[PDB]
């Protein structure tokens, strides 16, 4: 049975809302993938989550109560104000925007325009489609927001359409990183 | 069930495994990797180098909490009457970082979710041949169900005659699983 | 310099 594998996990969480006006500090103790003990600032003390944590609850609350409660300030609030403010909360990566047509262009035939919006940060963004300067609401859909893993995201936004003479389709993108909205045009030849 | 907020900071996630005394120490902010501490070099490795110039973290804090991981993994193992971890089969998804353009430098991303336990091999194959360069990967990220996910990156040049596979080797898989991808 | 949540020892 040498192939038996064992592991523990310690997962701390500082939940911030409206700056640091509201903070919820949660600490999870895990064996293999079973959370057996947890500290939650809203609760105010350590609580056994499963039978496995029964032996710890009392000891943890008697020994680490004050120190753990204080981390809401000494770790959470401190890290937010002193380290996140100047980095994470300051990161602004402008999205790259390009348009592609799904099928070969056939005048007056159904098709799909795909607006690829990539490499942006933070995750909050808004993409709109326009046909001859008028916003399209029907036939618009999008893929799931993708977290690239390198502090950038991407998303594909599609527009079911029918290319007609002289039409100009515009992919419109609003994001905190842009002083003004990015607009890319696709013209029906 | 999930707790909601504007931002989430995980300052000091500890993962300690046995046998092999395997550990990982990371900082996460809103789901992204701030850094991981290389326990052998005793060095904090930042995902975004520009960040390390405005903030820092003494790797010793990683060593300390990792040591406590080793301690707790033993007290808990014994306390559980040696209940071992139950393997899961991971799932891979392959996609490009930016739109693929012939001859345009790009990056292939292999996202692997449902990883458990956090021990795995993620490599790439080009034309069925393993790639040994331009490959990099994140640390293990935590999931709500306490399983993990990880991403591997492969720099490449889009070409009509190139085939790619993200190979994933894990104990929960009989044979390595290949997630194919073609431009 | 950043602070870190302390993994507390049991027993």
């Amino acid at each position, epitope marked *: 049975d040498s192939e038996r594998h064992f592991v523990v996990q310690f997962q701390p969480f500082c939940y911030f809302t409206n700056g640091t006006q509201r903070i919820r500090y949660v600490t999870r103790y895990i064996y293999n993938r079973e959370e057996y003990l947890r500290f939650d600032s809203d609760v105010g003390e350590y609580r056994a989550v499963t039978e496995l944590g029964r032996p710890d609850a009392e000891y943890y609350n008697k*020994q680490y109560l004050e120190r753990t409660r204080a981390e809401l300030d000494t770790v959470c609030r401190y890290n937010y104000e002193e380290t996140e403010v100047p980095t994470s909360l300051r990161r602004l990566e402008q999205p790259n925007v390009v348009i592609s047509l799904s099928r070969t262009e056939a005048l007056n035939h159904h098709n799909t325009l795909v607006c690829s919006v990539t490499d942006f940060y933070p995750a909050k963004i808004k993409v709109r489609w326009f046909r001859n300067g008028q916003e399209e609401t029907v036939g618009v859909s999008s893929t799931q927001l993708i977290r690239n893993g390198d502090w950038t995201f991407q998303v594909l936004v599609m527009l079911e359409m029918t290319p007609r003479r002289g039409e100009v389709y515009t992919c419109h993108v609003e994001h905190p990183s842009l002083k003004s909205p990015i607009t890319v045009e696709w013209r029906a030849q | 069930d999930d707790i909601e907020a504007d931002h989430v900071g995980s300052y000091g996630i500890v993962v300690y495994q046995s046998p092999g005394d395997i550990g990982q120490y990371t900082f996460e902010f809103d789901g992204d990797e701030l850094f991981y501490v290389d326990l052998d070099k005793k060095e904090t490795i930042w995902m975004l180098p520009e960040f390390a110039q405005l903030r820092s973290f003494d790797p010793q804090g990683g060593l300390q909490n990792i040591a406590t991981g080793k*301690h707790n993994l033993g007290v808990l193992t014994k306390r559980s009457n040696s209940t071992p971890a139950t393997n899961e089969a991971p799932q891979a998804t392959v996609f490009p970082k930016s739109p693929v353009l012939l001859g345009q430098p790009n990056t292939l991303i292999c996202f692997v979710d449902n990883i458990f336990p956090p021990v795995i091999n993620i490599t790439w194959l080009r034309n069925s041949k393993s790639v040994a360069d331009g490959v990099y990967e994140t640390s293990f990220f935590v999931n709500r169900d306490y399983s993990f996910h990880k991403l591997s990156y492969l720099t490449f040049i889009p070409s009509d005659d190139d085939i790619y596979d993200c190979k994933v080797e894990h104990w929960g898989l009989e044979e390595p699983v290949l997630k194919h991808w073609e431009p | 310099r950043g602070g870190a949540s*302390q993994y507390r020892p049991s027993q």
Partner: T-cell receptor, first 111, second 114 residues
Framework: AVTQSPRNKVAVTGEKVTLSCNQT?????MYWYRQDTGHGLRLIYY???????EKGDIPDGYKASRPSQENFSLTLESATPSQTSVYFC????????????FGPGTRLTVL | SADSVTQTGGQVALSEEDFLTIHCNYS??????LFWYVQYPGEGPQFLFR?????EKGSSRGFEATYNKEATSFHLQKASVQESDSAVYYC????????????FGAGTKLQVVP
């Protein structure tokens, strides 16, 4: 209780000196400090567990070993007069902002 | 500079039943926990109490100190000292880094005259 060995020791310049520390508190952390007038206590070396050795604030001229949980030694390869001091060993449970349990000290004088 | 603790000069002499105050100000780069230790003759320092955040008060055997982040102080207080209180008091701190490296001050010698 934390116990140090030896309690007293006179050495000559260039001598190889080793101070021993033992604790049965089952503490994961162990530390070596020196105490000197004007400086108070200064950390030389500490350990997070068996096999680990971390440099303190003033490691120069010193070396340490943590061969087991209970024991932690400090070694002065080549004793110099500046190393004359009172050395204190302490153990702790490695719980953030942990309290230290000190030994009664070892008075070392290098002549 | 590296974190440091600054406490009253060297030696102070009081009469029994006098009130005791030993100053301690700290210079730290993070958000440290603060402590006071007492070292009686022929012994090593022994823990008195700690305080993890601003406004928190630690206490033990009549001694107490309040975390004051505004003045970066952790001044020791004792209502009425006794001869047996004669010893060396140390101010110390640990950082929120998870480091567990405890930094001590220079110590203050207290002589409570019989």
């Amino acid at each position: 209780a934390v116990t140090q060995s030896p309690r007293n020791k006179v050495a000559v310049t260039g001598e190889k000196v080793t101070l021993s520390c033992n604790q049965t508190n089952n503490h994961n952390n162990m530390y070596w400090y020196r105490q000197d007038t004007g400086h108070g206590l200064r950390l030389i070396y500490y350990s997070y567990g068996a096999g680990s050795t971390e440099k303190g604030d003033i490691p120069d001229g010193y070396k340490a070993s943590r061969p087991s949980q209970e024991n932690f030694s400090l070694t002065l390869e080549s004793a110099t007069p500046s190393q004359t001091s009172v050395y204190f060993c302490a153990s702790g449970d490695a719980s953030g902002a942990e309290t230290l349990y000190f030994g009664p000290g070892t008075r070392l004088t290098v002549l | 500079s590296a974190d440091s603790v600054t406490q009253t000069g060297g030696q102070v002499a009081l009469s029994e039943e006098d009130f005791l105050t030993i100053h301690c100000n700290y210079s730290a780069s993070g958000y440290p926990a603060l402590f006071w230790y007492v070292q009686y003759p022929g012994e090593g320092p022994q823990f008195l109490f700690r305080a993890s955040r601003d406004k928190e008060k630690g206490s033990s055997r009549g001694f107490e100190a309040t975390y004051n982040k505004e003045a970066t102080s952790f001044h020791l207080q004792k209502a009425s000292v006794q001869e047996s209180d004669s010893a060396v008091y140390y101010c110390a701190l640990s950082e929120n880094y998870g480091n567990e490296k405890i930094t001590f001050g220079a110590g203050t010698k207290l002589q409570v005259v019989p």
